[PDB]
Amino acid sequence: FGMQRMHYRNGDPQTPFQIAEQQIQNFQVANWLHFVNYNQFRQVVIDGV
Amino acid sequence: MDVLYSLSKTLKDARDKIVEGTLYSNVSDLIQQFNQMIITMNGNEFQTGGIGNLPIRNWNFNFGLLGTTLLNLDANYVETARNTIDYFVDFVDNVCMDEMVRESQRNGIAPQSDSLRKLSAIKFKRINFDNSSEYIENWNLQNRRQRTGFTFHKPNIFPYSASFTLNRSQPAHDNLMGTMWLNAGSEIQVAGFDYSCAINAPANIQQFEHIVPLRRVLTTATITLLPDAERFSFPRVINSADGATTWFFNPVILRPNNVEVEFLLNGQIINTYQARFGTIVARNFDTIRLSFQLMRPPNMTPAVAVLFPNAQPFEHHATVGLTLRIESAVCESVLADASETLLANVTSVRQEYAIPVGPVFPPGMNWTDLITNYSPSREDNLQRVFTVASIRSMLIK
Amino acid sequence: MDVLYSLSKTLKDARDKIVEGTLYSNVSDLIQQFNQMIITMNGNEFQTGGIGNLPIRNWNFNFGLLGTTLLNLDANYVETARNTIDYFVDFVDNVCMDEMVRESQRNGIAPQSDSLRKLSAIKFKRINFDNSSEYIENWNLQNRRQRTGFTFHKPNIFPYSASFTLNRSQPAHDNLMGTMWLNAGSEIQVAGFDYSCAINAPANIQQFEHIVPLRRVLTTATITLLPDAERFSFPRVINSADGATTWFFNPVILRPNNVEVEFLLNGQIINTYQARFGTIVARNFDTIRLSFQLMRPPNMTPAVAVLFPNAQPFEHHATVGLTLRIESAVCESVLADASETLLANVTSVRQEYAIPVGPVFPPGMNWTDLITNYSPSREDNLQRVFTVASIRSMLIK
Amino acid sequence: MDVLYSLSKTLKDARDKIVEGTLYSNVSDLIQQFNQMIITMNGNEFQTGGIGNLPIRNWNFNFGLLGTTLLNLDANYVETARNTIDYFVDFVDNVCMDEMVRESQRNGIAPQSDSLRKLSAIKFKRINFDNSSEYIENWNLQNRRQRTGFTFHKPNIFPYSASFTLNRSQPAHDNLMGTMWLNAGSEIQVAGFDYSCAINAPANIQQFEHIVPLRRVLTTATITLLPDAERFSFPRVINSADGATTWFFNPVILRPNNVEVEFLLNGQIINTYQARFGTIVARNFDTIRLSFQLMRPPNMTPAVAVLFPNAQPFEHHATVGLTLRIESAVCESVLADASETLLANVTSVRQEYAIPVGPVFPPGMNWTDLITNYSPSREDNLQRVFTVASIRSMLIK
Ligand SMILES: [Zn+2]
16 A cells, blocks of 8 residues: 555554554455454353363 | 443443444443453342332343454444343343332442342442443542532422411401512522501511521522512412411512522521622522511602502502522532433332332422431432432433 | 434544644544544545525545654644544535435435435445434434433423413303413413302312323423412403403412322323422323312401402402423423524524425424424424434534 | 643543543553643642632642553552542642632733643643533634634523613603513513503504613524513502602503514614514524514403593503513523523632632622623633633532
8 A cells, every 4th residue: 555664663562463453544454454453262161171 | 339330331332332334443442341341240140129010030141242353343243232232221220220219217328229239249340430420420429528519400409388477467367467488499489568568667667588498508509589579479369377267468569678688508698699689699508598678668659659558458568579599509419400300210210110108208209398308318318319310311211 | 314423523522632732542542533534535525505595515525644653742733633624524514504404204314415315325334433412322222213212401392372261251251260371382371260269169169170282202201380370360451262352351369279280191190199289290191181170268358258249240350370390301202492402503504594495394493383283204304403403513513 | 721621631530430440441541641641740839829818829749650550440549549639639629719710801811820821831731631521612712713602501691680661751650651671681571561551542552662782692592482571560669760759550461462573683684573472593693672562452341441441540551561581592702591500610719718809800790790791801701710610610519
């Protein structure tokens, strides 16, 4: 999208995916970026464990 | 109580903020609170109702968390959110109707229903959210004993008291003297009458006085003070003090000479107003003293001089009135007024489910009998039930 | 409609939150929504106006995004934000004036202007934001057919109807009997009069009755019920029923014996009040039935006994009144009241641009003729135009 | 002024949002603003009070930043937050009481206290936060000279003016003609009377007229227009114009024939209403012209024909009234009304500390004398002091 190189400071509380989710105008690319941003496990208890 | 307001505030915001197509950053801080709420409320069972015709309902919470992975909220997320929100809204509706219906003489500020006594633990303390409404702010400030203020538009501080007083009377009831008044809602209409029009009073001046004690101390009150009380200005027949006979009252209206309106706090004159009408202000008071007087007009045209003879038959009776209407006032205790509907919600819940008369509140929730004897235990019960009514009025429209 | 409220909510917040010197974390979630709004609205053209004297304006959106790189917002960012906000505020002002001016008999709840029909697509659905105001909440709840409630302070539920009824009359008009009333705004003032003062009625008691049907079902209403209706308590001359002759009315006021105020819903007595004045509550009703009666006083002083002879010439006519004032009420349909200014905004837009009378609304937006015949199509049009008026009242002061 | 609202908005939110057990993401954007506030306010000293009995207090700010990282806010964080918030709330309370008490004839819109003149620097500009209340929004819009609107419920636009006018009079005072009126709060009650009941007027019609000029231009006003002014409908004795003698007024009430209510802006008829009562609307006006007329009834029953002879002794005087009550209106300038308590707060602060009468405001803050001569310098002072009163009413209940 012809954007800046994004000088990204080491120690930013947000990962580069987590600000590419808000800098980018497209839906599709940014929708997949937001799946990756807050992708995590479900903490489940099946069969005691 | 704090967690009940927190449940209702999150459910209100999650009906408002979680909509179809909205951006995730608009709701990114609400979904975390709603997930904390789901995590806290799972595994717990509740039981609401059981008094009057309010039915016993059992509540079991087994819900999955909401997703945190969308960029724009699609309709799947909105529909599963609407399901979880509708179940929690039904739960908090029945908890609020279970709490407004109960009362206690011993300590009314404590929760009385089983569900709100169960929610008052520290296990449920992580539900807690912002406390931004006026009633929950004054709840949290009076839970630490600080000064509060409820802002009322036309507060119902006066009990209904329509009566009179005869300073001069006889069984003929043809030469009377004294005051009449109507105290209703936020309005005092007073009228002192003399049948002789001060024809034998010293200096042709008859002094009237009307002292209204309040039940709670009002603060920063805007008050419309007008002369010429309109209700006591037309002819009427009135029963006597013992209710035996009736007497006739045919008023002609003089203007009130030498109006002195004093606003007493603990017997000390805080504000005073001498012959000033229109809008007045009273900064701190719990007693209103109206001191107006009737002066016989020394110059009268022949149309006026036939009204007031020196002899006994007075077919036209001199009458002097005032009107005092509290438009808005800040009171530390809870009241009812013309703006909120909280008393209406409390009475609607207590009358819909056919609730027996308990130890504290008057039968039928008579506000006149509730503000006539406004005890501090009844004050605590009224504040608690009004706070729960405000919570339910946030959720249930 | 949802996206129009969303545009106005973001423009209101971006006038409020985006100020000079404020921290970026205070506005970090608003700038993303405003950038989503700019990204959605670019490339689209709109056309507002074209009815009456409302001018046709063409709208083209070509704006750059706002910066997301400041720590404290400096005045450059505030000035470019104020430019973009002023253009969008002018756009939404003209869209709201284009929508409040139009109406349809067929389906009034649908958008009528071309701009709001264009905004009702899913391309514009990502504009959407929180729906927190009362009118957009009730819009979204009635778009899914759930229960709503608008809280009104003194609602204009009664059409203006000042008239009377003669239960006993003759062309001499010297021995009359019947009721008179004033239904205006939220206030009913009724007064039954008898010229004979029940001198030939059975048990010296004349029964009066006054039934007021409502147009929409009010819920949880606080009502000030006072005796002694003040307007019908002074002498007046009144035209007859056919308007031919006039008759004289010289009232003296008795108190209302045996007041029974009933609140009917579908003919069933929901609430009843027997000889209780002051503030009352009516939880659910659409008909108000006032049943007061005039009783001749059995004991009268000589000042009273000369008023009511047994013979024909009655120079003093017995009159008994009540006053019923709905202070606040929750109604499912839209109304007008003394608190909001939405009807005033609708009439100001329709009168400023010289708009022809359409098929639904009365000529000149007569609220008396609008609440006299309050059809459901007119209800849908009124709710839609009041919602758009609330949106414009958020943006335009 | 902007930073004072910002201090109060953060302290209000930090009493609301920072509670025990709440999630950190709910308060993650507020703690950064509160830390920016602490960082800005450290090292600075202030001095409040020094006029009247308002005591001189010195303020020194040396606080540690809220940087501890929590997931759920525990009670340690809540207690240290409550300490810092209570000190800042006491500071902003005394700054607001120092600003509402002062005034200037030269430029009243500027800050007058030393503390608010010190807060008006760009060092304190990073305190700034959202400006969402109505008074600070209209402050920021009038600081850039754009259109504003304050929405009032029953505005006190009319000064108290109870008087009359005798178009036909003589020292006998037995054949009088003219108007009487009461302008009070938001209510005009006018009544034109003729003693002859137009028995010698041309076509038995007497034209009355009553023109009320306003001080500020009201916009989009809902107005209840009723006939039959209730206050001027009972018999009374009234002093003359020079106050020498008194004259008697025994009214019987005809209905108002040919009511024409016109709403004038700069002499141009904006809205007009011909014989329409109930709720009316007036979109833009600063003069209200009521033109009603008394018509003698051509057909009268024998009970009416004895009231109005052709000769001189008129014991029953024809009287025709109207009532006009502005329920709600949008005004560009500040006013007082029955909804807010800001004038009550200003008068309470000025009367509590025994403040001398300055150059601008009337002695004792007489609102009748303030709206009688409502100069633009007094308008600027009143708007500034009402804005500071709104800020203190956010913090102090
Ligand atoms: Zn009101």
